Description:
Radius of gyration of chain A: 16 Å
CATH architecture of chain A: 3-Layer(aba) Sandwich
GO molecular function, one term (chain C): protein disulfide isomerase activity
Oligomer: heterotetramer
Number of helices of chain A: 5
Largest sheet of chain A: 7 strands, mixed
Radius of gyration of chain C: 22 Å
Subcellular location (chain C): Endoplasmic reticulum lumen
Helix content of chain A: 25-40%
GO biological process, one term (chain C): response to endoplasmic reticulum stress
Strand content of chain C: 15-25%
Shape of chain C: globular
Order of helices and strands of chain A: EEEHHEHEHEEEEHE
Structural class of chain C: alpha/beta
CATH class of chain A: Alpha Beta
Keywords (chain C): Chaperone, Disulfide bond, Endoplasmic reticulum, Signal, Stress response
Number of helices of chain C: 10
Largest interface: A-B, 30 and 32 residues
Strand order of the largest sheet of chain A: 2-1-5-4-3-8-9
CATH superfamily of chain A: Glutaredoxin
Strand order of the largest sheet of chain C: 10-12-11-13-14
Structural class of chain A: alpha+beta
Helix content of chain C: 25-40%
Shape of chain A: globular
CATH topology of chain A: Glutaredoxin
Protein name (chain C): Endoplasmic reticulum resident protein 44
Distance between the termini of chain A: 40 Å
Amino acid sequence: LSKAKISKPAPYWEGTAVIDGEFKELKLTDYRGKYLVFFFYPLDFTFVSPTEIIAFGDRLEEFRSINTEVVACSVDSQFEHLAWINTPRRQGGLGPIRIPLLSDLTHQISKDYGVYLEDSGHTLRGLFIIDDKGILRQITLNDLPVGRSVDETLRLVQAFQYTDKHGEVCPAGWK
Amino acid sequence: LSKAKISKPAPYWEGTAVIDGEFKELKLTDYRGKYLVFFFYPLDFTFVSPTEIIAFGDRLEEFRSINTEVVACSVDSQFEHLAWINTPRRQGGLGPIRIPLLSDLTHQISKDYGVYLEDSGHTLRGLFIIDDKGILRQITLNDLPVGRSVDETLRLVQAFQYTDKHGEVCPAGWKPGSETI
Amino acid sequence: EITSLDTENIDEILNNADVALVNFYADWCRFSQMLHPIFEEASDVIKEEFPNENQVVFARVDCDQHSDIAQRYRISKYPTLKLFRNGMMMKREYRGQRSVKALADYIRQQKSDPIQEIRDLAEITTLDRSKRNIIGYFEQKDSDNYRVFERVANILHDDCAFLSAFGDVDNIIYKPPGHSAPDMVYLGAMTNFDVTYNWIQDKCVPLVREITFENGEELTEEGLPFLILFHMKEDTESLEIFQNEVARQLISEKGTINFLHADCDKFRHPLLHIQKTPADCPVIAIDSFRHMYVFGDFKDVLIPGKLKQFVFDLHSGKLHREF
Amino acid sequence: ITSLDTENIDEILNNADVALVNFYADWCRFSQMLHPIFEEASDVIKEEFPNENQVVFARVDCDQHSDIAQRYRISKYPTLKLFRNGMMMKREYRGQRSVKALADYIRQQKSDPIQEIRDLAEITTLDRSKRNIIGYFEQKDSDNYRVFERVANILHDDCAFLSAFGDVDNIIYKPPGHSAPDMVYLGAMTNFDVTYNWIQDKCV
């Protein structure tokens, strides 16, 4: 039932995101021309701590140096996303965040990406790296509240771009 | 048709692996009690360089410190694996390697782990972390010739074992933040 | 109610309390917020079973606000609940279930009397090897001697069995694990808690002991930087040089440092983590669980200075260097 | 068709008019597959000329001779690089690897490159987005013309070289348009680096 495959176009999505405290409509093809790291961030009963979106948002400029945008997606509506954003993180909210929080209210994004568990309504923490032509280059799945790694995500993004520019060569760094 | 699901029992596999130039039979359930890093390593036309299996083999003791083994798997026969092992890296072979090279002769492992592309006979480079209870805790897929990372693999297994021992606590270092200790 | 501790009231409140269960929390962590109500209710349940105002005290520390207090007690995670008896911090955290009745039964357990009474000379026949034993001899169970013994028992009842009797000339005696070594009878004042607890402390808990990767777990969660002698198990000389020397120089560090020795051949990779090979043993190092620090050449451990200043340079964070 | 080493690099590398050298690594599968096409593309063009020493296809081990791998700043394996009598051209070979493409490109390095021109209508029709070094010379077997044509080889990508007859042996550089004037070269023409670094200066 998952539509996410390596080297095929990443499954299309569109929905309402919270960007800078306001509602914007977002489409996967908006990010055409740049790399997109797209990861799922459950706010449900498994939630434990704001750490991961804070970590990715604070370093988002590093991603933009390499022509990469970051967006998180969750199965809650834009309104509860804004409620979470307006809840201070001392009280168990996210506080201000600098990456778009996308809404999957219909659940079909989480299923297209094979990250949705239909028993609990819970989303596994998938992270996906999509290149500037919309091809899916990376799938990372686990259920860890935290987490993924901003360092290894950017390292993966740079590895993909190096493969795209130099495809028939071995860099000296390989042994 | 892929059977690999996070938090579910990892799909069983069995086959003949080359360990130290020798044929030994290997099963997933042999690794019960230890973590298993299990990744696919194509010797097909996509192959480019031994760098990665060597990288994991040289650091294999770091994984054994934390009670985890490493196994690579490919769809060549045990005999073609043995030929690859005896070809030194100067001539385009792997030379001696310190991690078992498992053979998926029937292709059923590569399909169970959702790594097999049936048009080309090619396997994506998947890496999967299986805990000491046989549960699959990690799925990592891409087609990069080289470019998984033993540092990130070890950090993941240690994160999984820490979650297993302390599940109701947030460790310090998760915060507004700096580096997430 | 739940006292919120800070740098000003921390010491007095914990010292005058006979039992204090303190909750080290951070509110950006959900496990902490989920704990707070259960903590409050458990506190009330115990407050009715008590107080005389000082029997049992539930307190809290916000480690976001006071990071000083947090690092003083080496809190690496949230929440962590710690037991302070008179302001000494018990080395075993509450790892139990988080529920009102689990916490309640826990406070009742630690407020219970660990000492087991006996009839004259009855089973002192056979206890031994197995565990350690210690038995106080009191003509009555209301005495300053027996309350001192009861405090020491409350702290130490996990590493030894404490018992009581009457009819012998007031004195407490120690029996080690076996019938080889005898008593070992305490000659000190039984009205002084510090010398008595130092004495029975001395028999119960060894100053250094063996790390093996099996109990590596238990000892890692003690939360202390290790100082280790790596030695081949045929080599007993380095190990008693080490025991003697940390008894001379570092004994004041008894509870801030775990002093351990490791079989050099099983811990090869811990020794691989540094420049040393299993035939470079004897080797002395601190493992902060962040990095490992070699002491240098072993024999320098014999000068009265070097080993004491070696650990104060971890406490002073001196040189890293190199690797 | 054989290698170099730490020592004789300068022996074969300097005397070779066009030296197309393959920096390789053996563990890299992309460089292991180019060897048969390298020497097959070799076998076609060194029978082509065969020219004693003009075009010579050689290789260098970046493993134990890795000392050459950072003298020349080698990063990718393989790196094909073209040397005019011992010097590094600022470019390398990035088109496809095949005997067709290599052969075509080292035959492509053999172009004139000079432009010998007729009655002069070209001197003002050269313009629109180029660079031109116009040679003026009487007799083209002289020491001057063959020094002008050795530096015509190395920079032939950076600008367009031309030649003519009958003024006084001088080099006249027309700059990028109708705006800036010349810029004529007065110097020692038959000797080497003084003529090289003039034209090198106004082609960059």
